[PDB]
Each structure stands twice: as C-alpha cells, then as structure tokens.
Design a protein around this ligand. Structure first.
Ligand SMILES: [Ca+2]
Lengths: 80, 100, 105, 99, 99, 80
DNA sequence: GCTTTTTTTTTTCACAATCCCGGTGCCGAGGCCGCTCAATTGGTCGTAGACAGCTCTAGCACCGCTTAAACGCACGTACGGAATC
C-alpha cells in the first residue's frame, strides 16, 4: 500500500522525546520520514542481498544484523 | 515427546552464567540480556582475532600466539580495561603453562 | 582428563575458543597460549559488564539482569561506552539526559 | 477554572517518561508494512522472520533517537529550542551520512 | 593614497589560494619535534623514518582541514561568520570524537 | 617550550583557510592545538604499538599507515 | 523626611501526575536429565620462526648561509551579542 504515513506524527514526537527534544517544528515530521525511509532502504538492500546470496526467499534476523554491521551500526541481541 | 532433535546452536550462555555467579551470586539474567551478552562476546572475539590476524600478517608470520592477542588487546580496549585484560590473560597463560 | 579451562583457572571454554580461531580464517596456525589468553580476556570483560549490570539491577530492586541494566552499566562507564560506542543494545533505552537550557528557570 | 500546563511542561514530562523507558515507540504493524513495502523494490514475494522486523525496528529507532540528540544540539547551538529540518540536515552532513 | 583592503578581503584571497594548492601548511620541523616529543611518552629512544613523520603530517593536516570545514558550518548555522571553540566542540561531538 | 607552540598561529590560519574559514576567534589557536595533540596522541600510540610488536626501535611509515587505518582515516600513497 | 503606588516576591491552595505499597497469577528463568558430538590425550612428522652473525641503509648530529616565514604592534572596520519588539 502506502505505509510511510503509518509513521505517525505522535510516534515521531515520541522518538524525539526519548532523544531529549522539547520543541519540534511542523516541518520535522515529513523530513524525518525521508530520513527513516533512506535509512531502511540501505539497511534492507544489504539484508536482501545477503538473503539472495543464501538462495533464500525469507529474510533472517542475521541478514539484518549482518547488514547493520555493514552500515557501522552494530546491533546486539538478535543473534549478533 | 516429539521426533527429530532441533539442530545445535552454540552460545556462551553457560559461561556467562558461571561468571555471573562469581560476581553476583544472588543475581540472574533475562533471555534478551543473555542474547546481548552473547552478541558482545562474539563482537569482541571477532575484533581481537581480526587484529591479531592482521598483526601476524603485517610481520609476515603464519602463527597467532598469545603475543598477538596481547598486542591486539592493547590496540582495542581503553586504558584500565586493557591493563586488567592484559593481567588476566597473562595470569591465565602463566597458570596454564605451569599446570602443563 | 581435565579441561584446558581448569588448567588456566577459567570459566570460558579455552578448547572452544581455540577451535573458533582455527575455523575462523584468522591465520594458518594458532599458538597454544593464544586461546588461553583470549578466553581470559572475554571472561574479564564479561565479568566487568556483569558486575556493573548486576549493580543496576539491584538499584532497580530486581534480581535478574535485563537489557536496560546492561545499557545503563555500559553508558555510565566511560571505558565501556568507548569500547561499545558503535554498538546498539536492543531494548536498552537511553540514559536520562535533558539539556540544561531546556529546563524551566 | 479548568487546569492547564504551560507550553513546555508536558514536553519535559514526555522526555522523562520516554528516556526512562525502553519500549519501541513506533507502532509495530505500520512499521512492518513499511518494511515489506520497501523490500518489494529490491525483490518481490519476500518473507521475513518476525525477529528480522523487530531487529529492523530496534535499529531504526536507535538511529533516529540518536539523530534527534545531535539535532537537538544543533538547534541549541543556534540559540534555539525548536528542532528544524536544517538542524537534522547539518547533523547528518557532519556525521558524513549526506554530502 | 595608502592602499587598504577591507577586513575579509585578504582572508578570501587566502582561502582561494590555499584551496588551489596541495603543499603542507605546517612548518615541517616544529611538527617533527612535536611528533618526537609525544612519541617519547609511549617509548624512549624512538627513531622515525622521514616518510613516517610525513605520513603523520599529511594525516594531521587533512583531518584538521576537514574539521575546519565542519566547524565552519557550525558557525554559519548559528548565524555567524567567525569560527569559535564551541563550533569545534559541537562538530567533534556530532562526529563521535568526544562525548 | 612546548613543541605544541611550534604549530604557530599563522600555520593554523592557513589550515583553516584550506577548510574555507573566513574569520577566526583568537581562542581557536589553543583549541586547535588541543585537538591536534589528541589526534597525534591517538595515532602515534597505535603506530608505536605496531613498532614495539615488530621488535624494532624505528617507527616505519607502514606503522603509521596501519595506525591511521585502525583510527578510520585510511591513507593513500605511503606504502598502502 | 515620609506617605501612596506599584511590581516583586512570596506565600497559600487546588489539582494533575507520578510513585510506592501489597495482592495476584502467569510464564520463562533455571536446573535436571540423557544423549551426542567435539574436546582431550597421546601418539608422529615437519617446518616456521628464534637465533646468530653480517651487511650497509638510512636515520641522526652538526655546521653555515639565505632568505621567508613568524612575531609585535599601530589602527579601525566590521562583526558579535545584547536588548526590544
Ligand atoms: Ca624463513
């Protein structure tokens, strides 16, 4: 469908709050969706690359952990 | 019960537990927390090993010895962490050699 | 027969570590002292995180370590925070830290 | 009179609340659909381990939380309290993510 | 008729000049003695291949130039044209050099 | 006195010129010296480690190159 | 000097929200069990690196000359930061 809107305003505000943000421009929310999307495209492309190299039709968490390590964004706790 | 054994999956968790009961005997550890401790041990294994692999390779040597591990450790860990980790690795080698 | 771990006075599996080294494409050959040295280092580091992660639990009035407890422990120690600066601990959350200028007067 | 907090006071509460907590702050389903949607551009009819989507979410939110820290510093640096697109953009330019 | 350039004009000429050139901009000897001075604090009676000290300089100069580019944006971001210590500090904070 | 002062105000001004800076606070010259010393500290520490590991009393260019690669600042042209 | 006027400042005073407590009940930490697979023990061969002994590279010490860059300082313009709106 068209799911990027499903990253709602309030959910963006929540993340920003955890990030210590007090006041938030009206323009931030679309700007953040762009960044989040860019972030996902890159991580997933490498994940999928790993999946395809393994001749599988199902992305594993390792595919994603390995992709994340490739982006200098190591993740612990999903078999890493 | 049900047939076919689930396929083996190595972990460090029994050793995390054992170290846990030395350091904090009245303290346990959650499922995901252990996944983290595993992901940690594996991270640092990889880092240390890789650097030792390189050290050995730069100085034209086929063999990774306790020497390489020490040097890698000095390169990788911060100050106090390296000292202690160097002490314990030395202790462990010293102790192992004399118990042959 | 007694394990190489027991000879070295360790909890971590010296035999396992030695095999991982042989099977991980690091060098052609592996010294006997290497896996002993390494195992010990991984155990030390592990002990140093568990000491600090236990303290965060006890301080939360909890018996079992969770991801938060690890995170708190790690980021509140300058050295560990450095070691794991580019590492994300899932279900860790962040240290409470509100910038002083954002506070009321 | 009906009670009212002044602008800034609930914002600070929300901070204290979410910094205390560790739960994921994006709604799991809309995220999962987004993961599947992006993944189609590269390869169609793809399955996902559930843990792979959780991993992907854990990673997204840690990235973005972190990015908001840097962003909040860039707004503060220009004597502002409000984050703006140019704050995010500068942060990212310095991190090296963007040219 | 004594000629005078306005504040900024020569700076602008210098930028243009130095961007065009590739030659190292720190005097080599004071640099070499600084490398030797700092090297003592780890090991005494250390010898340096000349190329080793040149690598170190090529390295030091690229990193600092780069940091100035990032610092410069931090100044501009705060509606200034003058770089200041806090600009360098934000930059290195965002780069992940300092906490 | 300090070799750090051998990195002069005019050399610093040139570096910041190459990095496109037009106007420079007086304070920067010390601040810069701080950063630069920490930079060298970190790179030299790791280089000398490679030297001490090679059983030499002479730091080669390669020692620096490996030290600069480890620090994420890969360097071309010096026996890479 | 003191009265009047006025903002501060400071205290009462309701009300929302966040914190502790015990009570409850459920589910995964935890440990036990029996099997399997990888670690150990104890063989042998082979060479990889420690070592001595030599070469001779290039890294350091040092001097004397020529500028070129570094250093102060006199001067003022244009920036920064404060304040108000
Ligand atoms: Ca040989």
């Amino acid at each position: 469908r068209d799911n990027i809107q499903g990253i709602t305003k309030p959910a963006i505000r929540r993340l920003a709050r955890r990030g210590g943000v007090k006041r938030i421009s009206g323009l931030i929310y679309e700007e953040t969706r762009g960044v989040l999307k860019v972030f996902l495209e890159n991580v997933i492309r490498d994940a999928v690359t790993y999946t395809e190299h393994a001749k599988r039709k199902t992305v594993t968490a390792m595919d994603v952990v390995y992709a994340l390590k490739r982006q200098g964004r190591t993740l612990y706790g999903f078999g890493g | 019960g049900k047939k076919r054994k689930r396929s083996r999956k190595e972990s460090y968790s029994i050793y995390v537990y054992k170290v846990l009961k030395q350091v904090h005997p009245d303290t346990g550890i959650s499922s995901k927390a252990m996944g983290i401790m595993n992901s940690f041990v594996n991270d640092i294994f990889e880092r240390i090993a890789g650097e030792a692999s390189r050290l050995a390779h730069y100085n034209k040597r086929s063999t990774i010895t306790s020497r390489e591990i020490q040097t890698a450790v000095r390169l990788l860990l911060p100050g106090e962490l390296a000292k202690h980790a160097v002490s314990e690795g030395t202790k462990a080698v010293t102790k192992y050699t004399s118990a042959k | 027969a007694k394990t190489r771990s027991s000879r070295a006075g360790l909890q971590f599996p010296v035999g396992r570590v030695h095999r991982l080294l042989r099977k991980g494409n690091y060098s052609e050959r592996v010294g006997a002292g290497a896996p002993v040295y390494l195992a010990a280092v991984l155990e030390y580091l592990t002990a140093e995180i568990l000491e600090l992660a236990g303290n965060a639990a006890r301080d939360n009035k909890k018996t079992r370590i969770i991801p938060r407890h690890l995170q708190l422990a790690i980021r509140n120690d300058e050295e560990l925070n450095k070691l794991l600066g580019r590492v994300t601990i899932a279900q860790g959350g962040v240290l409470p830290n509100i910038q002083a200028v954002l506070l009321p007067k | 009179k009906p009670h009212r907090y002044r602008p800034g006071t609930v914002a600070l509460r929300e901070i204290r609340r979410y910094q205390k907590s560790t739960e994921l702050l994006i709604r799991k389903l809309p995220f999962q659909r987004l993961v599947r949607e992006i993944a189609q551009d590269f390869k169609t009819d793809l399955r996902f381990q559930s843990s792979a989507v959780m991993a992907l979410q854990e990673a997204c939110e840690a990235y973005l939380v972190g990015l908001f820290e840097d962003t909040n510093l860039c707004a503060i640096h220009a004597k502002r309290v409000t984050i703006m697109p140019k704050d995010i953009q500068l942060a990212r330019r310095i991190r090296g993510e963007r040219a």
